[PDB]
């Protein structure tokens, strides 16, 4: 489990923390969102690569197209918090508190 | 599977991916195919149980092979401990490892 | 905390359109380098 | 020095990752995935992922432009933030750099590192194995397979994405 | 939403829970949370009302970090053991990564806070799709792997679900608030049963599924939201009020209706596993969410409550709409107890 | 057919693009089923030969499989010559 | 866990071919119909013992016949040869397309000079038999000790005793 | 005029594959002996550089099985020079 | 090595013509030559407030269109199977289900652009 | 000798670019009765050289509401994008022998507009966001018939190597086999590039500017020399793909005086639109693309998976 390892997995959590700690930007969230993306993407080519899972290489594609897919998702569902709200800091869509 | 309709309905949906050993395009074997299929066919109708117990070296030696986990560390300590004797200057590698 | 409304729906809030305007001139070649060329547009369409 | 560019690569892999996880503005969010997507699509191609590599870095790039193309259409702030300006981003960003700078001084002084699962430090190329392709490339020949063996996966896959559409609209449309 | 696409749209849903329960490779489990996250995100805002919008965006952004953080513990899962298979997994971590990664989808612990606003937010039609079919995807994950899971954690997941859904529902007033901490309360009390009998939570997940569905159609029918517009429904309507007295006293598990079987059934089943304390825990705390539903039945049509004048011609109408198995869910809901022994078919 | 034909020509006039691309689209689907060298093709990407003819023991009773790579049983694939 | 039993030195210092890459690509077809048999023998050997460790003989014999057919070709025909595989050797891909008239001076020269035919298309890519008399590895992977079955599931059904036996239900 | 050119391009590439087949034998028969040859030298140089240490008895399997496991590319080369490695592994994929 | 020779001489090229068009002009600049550009007359104010555009219904589809041209991306090697049946009914699927989702994208207002 | 092949290819193409400015205006003057450059020097030939002089003299200036590291980045993206990107053209050998060429040229291409808006934002400036905003989307959806032409094209290759199209059209070109995907393919790198019945990037008629808002000597010249080399290339891409040539491989001289033909025959054809047409308004150059290119593309795509199936002319893999 060389150091390349370490990095990813590293790197996913800072993209768990990154996603978890919403500051003050629904876009700047979704950004952390697709960042989770990269890691998991990327470890997982290293893994089928290395292990030479041939039939699995296809497993790293199917990721991507579900990728995108929810990407999609989120800049939709920002599209209509900022058009009616006018900006995307995820605080003004509080109404739901009660 | 929670309700196994891939075994009643008697066709493949998943069933060709999920191991390393079965029909690879044009026969490309895994790198742990051996490892794996004598895991696989050690614990096979066991139960995952018995297989826990019994297919467990099979199964370190499938992921030790997966990983190299303990074979790296070897070849960690020694690269570790040559370093050191190289430094030292007990002894030098021999001309084969130059060139 | 006040009551949820009762038709599950929030009055709309404050107007959120700011209409980009600006001079198209008349420093432009295409607007006769005469016309200060001023619009209101809907984002993009006048 | 060209020892092993896997971890170098990576390096700028997690301080391009530490980037746009520190909230910067959302336009420059985009430049720090941007940076650790092209590199993380170096590492894939240096392990031998050719086609992986490059395919990462054109649907990323697609993907990340329609996303900061939509931050200046309605996510702007009027004035926008930076990588310095407001303290918070700033202490963020530096949390990022000063804890990834640590784990990889705590990696390359020991290599016996033991955080969560164990990591040794001895070199990624090590866990390259021996062996022709013949003349086919492996990773080529594995992703071809999806319409011979994967036809479960390319109707589950093409099923969603064309519902994909349909939510896009159906969200979008209102009223 | 036209018509049509709304049927599609669903199908996809249950064409997404469906995959989950049928497939066995871990990359298609995670194919089919997608799926179902994606179709239903238009499902909740389906009437475009402004409070829909964040009510399907807190589902959005907590669910797409459960179906990461899924992706991410199958792929330790992999690189620890090579397989795609549901057997168990031979990382502690990817499992102790997992049982989160699912309970967010499943709203047991801390990992709970978007459960009520988004029941709250949405229209009842959706939230009766919510409560009841988004939970046999993520519990038939669990019961699969139900041998690789540490039972200190899924223990603490599940006790903490029934201590604050219990805790919660005493401060609620809108009757979608009171539903989802009751659902997460009945979310412990199955998931806790998980690690020793997996027949069991499915016992409980059918009653489960009863007792929400008979009560959210009796609201539909009675177009109540909160708990002074349920109280005059007994000028109008007595007998739908009448009746949801039994499934209230049903939900809150006083035997002999239906609504025993699970907290009895699972008491029995864990008690012969040595564990003692626990089951006699949420025995007590299990009384929270019976007040809060004794108060809904006070409210409702054990007290006749002050009425409106603009009821007059209300009584001249009756419901066009045709809720079906309302009478025969109402009957599972409430009186199955002498089929107990029926568990056995699921087993 | 009239009202075919009244459609097609309509159609033909205002969207030219459509009537063609749904015409090629169509094309590309019912063709290849009906044309008889598909069954080719898969003949020819199973005769390449990308691994190696792995020999197999020879323990008699093996009649159809040749001993040396000039022998004349075993499959011939002179047809691709031909073709 | 065990030794690894590497080979001496010795039995890996057979003669080592020496011909460039373009060389042996000119003889291809030739070469492996006249040098089939140790060939063939060699990899069943590689296939079936799944051990080069076990198989090294097998490969002296391919290096040995490799020698003759090339000591062959230089005896008869070294000049042809030599200008067929040089003019492989300039193309950076190795393609036969483009040396067909050098070919042709290969060919006729071995096939009148040596007796050698060259083999028709897909005939070089069949299946061949060997008849090797080592014996079949009898567990080429060393598989250990197959895990006894569990219990078979058999015998009648009958009603069960005093039904469901759960609480306060006799039937 | 596709059609016809492409068929004679697999007519081509059967004959290169062919000539492939012919060739394999020799190159898997010198490379097994050249790994057999690398981790030989590797055993000899690790008991010369481990003979003082506590315990390293010379060259244990680390799996359990007494098949043999295609080696790691980092045992082969891993005391060997820089060039050696860099050639061995990012030598194919960098080669453009 | 072959391949990061070139991108590294690309981008000290590039950064060299940067570098010596910043210093080898010299400057005489005040606070009205750095004044942002409006053809003339004074900015309203603008060029960061929120610019909605119109196209961002068939701006996201492209993302979900690029996917699919991912998806067909490794058609050339799929071409080299033994059960082009199967590939040819799986490739064509793709591309139907991609001009379906175009044909219903296109027929609810889709690809018009808001006003 | 690798510094001296990538100095071999550098110097020679901003050289080809440099000069192309040149051809342009005195090609632009022949179509329009004018002469075009004349004066600096014989025939002209000193006019750009002392454009590009003046150019690296007169002050630059970073706009006042710029955002400096943003502003001076996009040049470096643009040129550098550029000039990577002829790497792996196959000019008899190609410099660079990628497995995958055709892939890379695709991802790198879709890059280069990172520059345009990447300037157009960091600009800060009305006419600037306008002009990066419409360039984005233009180039994104004139992006997918891209990839869908340069894949229904190669599937007749085999592969995605830049090499195998001197083989793959060694008796026939390519173009008598694909005509139509030849037509959108050559309007979309006329789209991709911003060459003008869609340079509506630049916009100078509505939007004054926009491939370069208030930049200066220096970046002005980076983002005009880094869209002038695309157009060179636009159109050799152009030419190795469709209009193959005879290569000798003991003579590549005359491949690479064939290939050289070619992309100076089409660039031609680039600078001859650029004079016969107005401006494509935005809705329309969108339409076109969403509405009647994409249709057709995908049709001719499912053709041509087809087609070697029915005739059996499956390309070589290797
Ligand atoms: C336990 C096992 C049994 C489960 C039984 C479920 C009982 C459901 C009772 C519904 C009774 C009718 C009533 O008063 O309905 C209210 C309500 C609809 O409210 P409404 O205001 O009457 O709707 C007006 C229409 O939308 C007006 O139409 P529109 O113009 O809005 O167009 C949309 C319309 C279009 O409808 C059609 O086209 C038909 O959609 C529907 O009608 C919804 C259903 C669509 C078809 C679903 C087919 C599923 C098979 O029903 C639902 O919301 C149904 C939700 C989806 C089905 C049930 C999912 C929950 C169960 C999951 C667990 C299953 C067991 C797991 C173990
Ligand atoms: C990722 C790493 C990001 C590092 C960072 O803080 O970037 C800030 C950098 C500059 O932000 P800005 O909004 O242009 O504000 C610059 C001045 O604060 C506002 O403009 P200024 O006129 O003050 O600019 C001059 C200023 C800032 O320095 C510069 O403008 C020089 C170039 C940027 C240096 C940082 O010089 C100094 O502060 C003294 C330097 C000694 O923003 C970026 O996006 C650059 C990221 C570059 C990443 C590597 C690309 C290869
Ligand atoms: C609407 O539509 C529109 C368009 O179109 C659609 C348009 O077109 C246009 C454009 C308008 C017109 C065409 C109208 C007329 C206008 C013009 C012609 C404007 C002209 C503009 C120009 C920019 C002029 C271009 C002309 C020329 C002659 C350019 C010439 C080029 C040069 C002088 C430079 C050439 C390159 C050189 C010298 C490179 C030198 C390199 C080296 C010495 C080596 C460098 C590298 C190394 C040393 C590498 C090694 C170093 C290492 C390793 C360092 C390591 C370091 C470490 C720290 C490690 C508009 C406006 C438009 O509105
Ligand atoms: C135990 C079940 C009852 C628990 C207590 C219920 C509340 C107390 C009873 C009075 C409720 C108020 C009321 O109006 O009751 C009468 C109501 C029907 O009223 P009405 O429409 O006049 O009846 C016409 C009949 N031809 O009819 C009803 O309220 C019917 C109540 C039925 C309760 C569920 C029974 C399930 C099966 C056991």
Request: net charge negative; glycine share 8%.
């Given at each position: 489990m060389p150091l390349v390892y370490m990095n990813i997995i590293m790197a996913f959590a800072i993209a768990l923390a990154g996603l978890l700690?919403?500051?003050?930007?629904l876009m700047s969230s979704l950004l952390c969102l697709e960042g989770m993306m990269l890691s998991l993407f990327i470890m997982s080519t290293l893994i089928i690569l290395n292990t030479h899972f041939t039939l699995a290489n296809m497993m790293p594609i199917i990721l991507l197209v579900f990728a995108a897919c929810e990407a999609a998702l989120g800049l939709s569902l920002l599209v209509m918090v900022s058009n009616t709200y006018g900006t995307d800091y995820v605080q003004n869509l509080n109404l739901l508190q009660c | 599977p929670f309700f196994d309709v891939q075994k009643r309905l008697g066709?493949?949906?998943?069933?060709?991916?999920?191991?390393?050993?079965?029909?690879?395009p044009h026969k490309?074997?895994?790198?742990c195919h051996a490892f794996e299929k004598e895991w696989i066919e050690c614990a096979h109708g066991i139960g995952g149980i018995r297989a826990e117990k019994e297919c467990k070296i099979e199964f370190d030696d499938f992921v030790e092979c997966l990983l190299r986990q303990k074979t790296m560390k070897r070849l960690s300590a020694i690269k570790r401990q040559r370093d050191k004797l190289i430094k030292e200057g007990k002894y030098t590698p021999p001309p084969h490892h130059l060139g | 905390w006040k009551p949820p409304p009762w038709n599950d729906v929030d009055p709309p809030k404050?107007?959120?359109?700011?209409?980009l305007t600006l001079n198209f001139?008349?420093?432009?070649?295409?607007?006769?380098?005469?016309?200060?060329l001023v619009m209101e547009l809907s984002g993009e369409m006048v | 020095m060209t020892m092993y560019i896997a971890f170098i690569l990576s390096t700028i892999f997690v301080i391009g990752f530490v980037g746009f996880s520190s909230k910067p503005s959302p336009i420059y969010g985009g430049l720090g995935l941007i940076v650790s997507g092209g590199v993380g699509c170096g590492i894939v191609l240096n392990f031998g992922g050719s086609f992986l590599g490059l395919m990462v870095f054109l649907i990323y790039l697609g993907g990340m432009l329609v996303v900061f193309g939509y931050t200046t259409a309605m996510?702007?702030?009027?004035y926008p933030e930076v990588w310095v300006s407001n303290k918070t981003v700033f202490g963020a960003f530096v949390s990022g750099l000063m804890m990834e700078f640590c784990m990889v001084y705590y990696a390359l002084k020991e290599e016996e590192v033991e955080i969560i699962f164990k990591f040794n430090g001895l070199?990624?190329?090590?866990?390259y194995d021996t062996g022709d392709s013949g003349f086919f490339s492996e990773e080529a020949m594995g992703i071809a397979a999806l319409y011979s063996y994967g036809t479960w996966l390319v109707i589950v896959t093409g099923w969603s994405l064309l519902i994909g559409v349909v939510v896009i609209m159906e969200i979008t449309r209102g009223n | 939403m036209n018509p049509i696409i709304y049927t599609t749209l669903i199908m996809t849903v249950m064409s997404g829970t469906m995959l989950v329960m049928i497939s066995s490779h871990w990359l298609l489990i995670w194919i089919g949370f997608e799926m179902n996250l994606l179709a239903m995100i238009p499902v909740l805002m389906?009437?475009?009302?402004?409070?829909?919008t964040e009510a399907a965006t807190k589902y959005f952004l907590t669910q797409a970090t459960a179906s990461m953080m899924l992706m991410m513990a199958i792929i330790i899962n992999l690189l620890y053991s090579g397989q795609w298979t549901?057997?168990?997994?031979?990382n502690p971590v990817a499992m102790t990564m997992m049982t989160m990664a699912l309970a967010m989808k499943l709203g047991?612990?801390?990992?709970?806070?978007?459960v009520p606003e988004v029941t709250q937010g949405i229209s009842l039609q959706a939230g009766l799709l919510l409560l009841t079919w988004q939970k046999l995807a993520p519990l038939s994950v669990l019961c699969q792997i139900?041998?690789?899971?540490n039972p200190n954690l899924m223990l603490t997941m599940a006790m903490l679900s029934i201590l604050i859904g219990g805790w919660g529902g005493?401060?609620?007033?809108?009757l979608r608030k009171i539903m989802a901490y009751s659902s997460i309360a009945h979310m412990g009390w199955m998931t806790a049963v998980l690690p020793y009998n997996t027949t069991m939570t499915i016992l409980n997940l059918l009653i489960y599924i009863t007792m929400t569905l008979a009560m959210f159609m009796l609201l539909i029918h009675s177009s109540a939201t909160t708990t002074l517009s349920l109280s005059?429904?007994?000028?109008?309507?007595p007998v739908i009020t009448s009746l949801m007295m039994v499934t209230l006293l049903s939900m809150g598990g006083?035997?002999?209706?239906?609504?025993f079987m699970p907290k009895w059934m699972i008491i029995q089943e864990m008690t012969k596993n040595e564990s003692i304390i626990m089951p006699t825990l949420m025995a007590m705390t299990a009384l929270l969410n019976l007040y809060f539903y004794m108060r809904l039945a006070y409210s409702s049509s054990l007290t006749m409550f002050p009425s409106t004048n603009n009821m007059k011609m209300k009584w001249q109408f009756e419901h066009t709409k045709q809720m079906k198995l309302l009478p025969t869910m109402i009957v599972l809901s409430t009186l199955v107890l002498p089929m107990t022994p029926a568990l056995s078919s699921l087993n | 057919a009239g009202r075919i034909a009244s459609f097609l020509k309509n159609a033909w006039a205002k969207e030219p693009v459509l009537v063609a691309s749904f015409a090629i689209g169509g094309l590309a689907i019912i063709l290849p089923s009906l044309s008889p060298y598909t069954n080719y093709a898969i003949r020819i990407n199973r005769a390449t030969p990308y691994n190696y003819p792995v020999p197999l023991r020879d323990?008699?009773?093996?009649?159809?499989?040749?001993?040396?790579?000039?022998?004349?049983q075993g499959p011939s694939l002179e047809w691709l010559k031909n073709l | 866990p065990g030794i690894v039993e590497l080979p001496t030195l010795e039995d890996l210092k057979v003669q080592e071919v020496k011909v460039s890459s373009s060389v042996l690509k000119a003889a291809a077809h030739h070469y492996g119909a006249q040098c089939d048999k140790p060939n063939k023998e060699f990899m069943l050997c590689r296939w079936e013992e799944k051990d080069p460790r076990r198989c090294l003989e097998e490969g002296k014999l391919v290096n040995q016949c490799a020698l003759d057919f090339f000591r062959q070709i230089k005896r008869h025909c070294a000049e042809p040869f030599t200008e067929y595989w040089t003019c492989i050797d300039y193309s950076g891909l190795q393609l036969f397309r483009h040396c067909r008239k050098q070919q042709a001076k290969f060919d006729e020269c071995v096939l009148d000079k040596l007796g050698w035919v060259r083999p028709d298309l897909g005939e070089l890519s069949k299946v061949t038999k060997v008849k090797t008399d080592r014996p079949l590895p009898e567990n080429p992977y060393h598989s250990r000790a197959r895990p006894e079955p569990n219990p078979e599931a058999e015998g009648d059904l009958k009603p069960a005793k005093h039904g469901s036996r759960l609480f306060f239900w006799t039937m | 005029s596709m059609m016809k050119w492409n068929r004679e391009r697999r007519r081509l590439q059967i004959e290169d594959f062919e000539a492939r087949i012919a060739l394999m034998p020799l190159f898997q028969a010198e490379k097994d002996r050249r790994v057999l040859q690398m981790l030989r030298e590797n055993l000899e140089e690790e008991a010369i550089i481990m003979?003082?240490?506590?315990?390293?008895?010379?060259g244990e399997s680390?799996?359990?099985?007494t098949r043999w496991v295609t080696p790691m590319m980092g045992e082969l080369y891993?005391?060997?020079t820089n060039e050696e490695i860099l050639s061995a592994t990012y030598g194919f994929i960098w080669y453009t | 090595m072959n391949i990061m020779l070139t991108l590294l001489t690309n981008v000290t090229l590039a950064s060299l013509l940067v570098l010596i068009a910043f210093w080898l002009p010299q400057l005489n600049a005040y606070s009205e030559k750095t004044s942002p550009y409006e053809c003339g007359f004074d900015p309203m104010?603008?060029?960061?407030?929120?610019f909605s555009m119109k196209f961002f219904l068939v701006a996201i589809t492209f993302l979900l269109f690029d996917l699919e041209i991912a998806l067909l991306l490794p058609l050339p090697w799929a071409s080299?199977?033994?059960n082009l049946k199967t590939m040819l009914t799986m490739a064509l699927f793709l591309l139907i289900l991609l001009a379906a989702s175009l044909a219903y994208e296109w027929t609810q207002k889709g690809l018009e652009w808001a006003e | 000798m690798f510094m001296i092949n990538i100095l071999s290819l550098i110097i020679p193409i901003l050289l080809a670019v440099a000069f192309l400015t040149l051809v342009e205006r005195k090609v632009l003057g022949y179509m329009q009765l004018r002469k075009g450059p004349?004066?600096?020097?014989?025939?002209?030939?000193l006019q750009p050289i002392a454009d590009a002089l003046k150019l690296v003299t007169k002050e630059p200036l970073r706009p006042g509401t710029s955002s400096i590291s943003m502003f001076i980045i996009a040049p470096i993206l643009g040129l550098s994008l550029a000039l990577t990107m002829?790497?792996?053209?196959?000019?008899?050998?190609?410099?660079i022998n990628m497995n995958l060429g055709v892939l890379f040229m695709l991802a790198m291409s879709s890059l280069a507009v990172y520059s345009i808006l990447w300037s157009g934002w960091a600009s800060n400036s009305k006419y600037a966001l306008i002009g990066a905003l419409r360039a984005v989307a233009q180039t994104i959806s004139y992006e997918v018939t891209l990839a869908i032409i340069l894949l229904s094209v190669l599937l007749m290759n085999?592969?995605?190597?830049?090499?195998?199209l001197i083989t793959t059209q060694?008796?026939?070109?390519?173009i008598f086999t694909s005509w139509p995907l030849a037509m959108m393919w050559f309007i979309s790198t006329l789209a991709e590039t911003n060459?003008?019945?869609?340079?509506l990037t630049e916009?100078?008629?509505?939007?004054?500017?926009?491939?370069?808002?208030?930049?200066?000597a220096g970046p002005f010249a980076m983002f005009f020399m880094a869209e002038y080399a695309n157009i060179i290339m636009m159109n050799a891409f152009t030419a190795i793909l469709f209009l193959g040539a005879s290569h000798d491989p003991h003579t590549p001289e005359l491949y690479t005086i064939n290939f050289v033909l070619k992309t100076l025959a089409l660039t031609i054809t680039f600078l001859w639109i650029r004079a016969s047409y107005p401006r494509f308004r935005y809705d329309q150059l969108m339409h076109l693309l969403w509405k009647s290119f994409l249709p057709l593309t995908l049709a001719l795509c499912m053709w041509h998976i087809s087609l070697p199936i029915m005739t059996a002319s499956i390309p070589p893999q290797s």
């Open positions: 700690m919403y500051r003050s930007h | 066709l493949d949906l998943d069933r060709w991916m999920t191991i390393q050993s079965a029909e690879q490309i074997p895994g790198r | 404050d107007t959120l359109v700011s209409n001139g008349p420093q432009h070649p295409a607007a006769h380098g005469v016309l200060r | 996510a702007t702030e009027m070199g990624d190329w090590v866990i | 389906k009437n475009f009302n402004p409070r829909a549901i057997t168990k997994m031979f047991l612990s801390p990992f709970h806070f978007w139900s041998q690789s899971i005493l401060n609620q007033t809108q005059h429904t007994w000028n109008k309507m006083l035997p002999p209706l239906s609504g | 323990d008699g009773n093996m009649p159809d499989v040749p001993s040396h790579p000039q022998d004349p | - | 003979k003082d240490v506590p315990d390293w008895k010379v680390v799996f359990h099985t891993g005391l060997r | 104010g603008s060029a960061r407030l929120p080299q199977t033994n | 004349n004066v600096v020097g014989p025939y002209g030939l002829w790497v792996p053209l196959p000019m008899p050998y190609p410099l085999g592969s995605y190597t830049l090499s195998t060694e008796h026939i070109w390519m060459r003008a019945p869609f340079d916009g100078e008629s509505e939007l004054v500017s926009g491939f370069n808002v208030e930049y200066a």
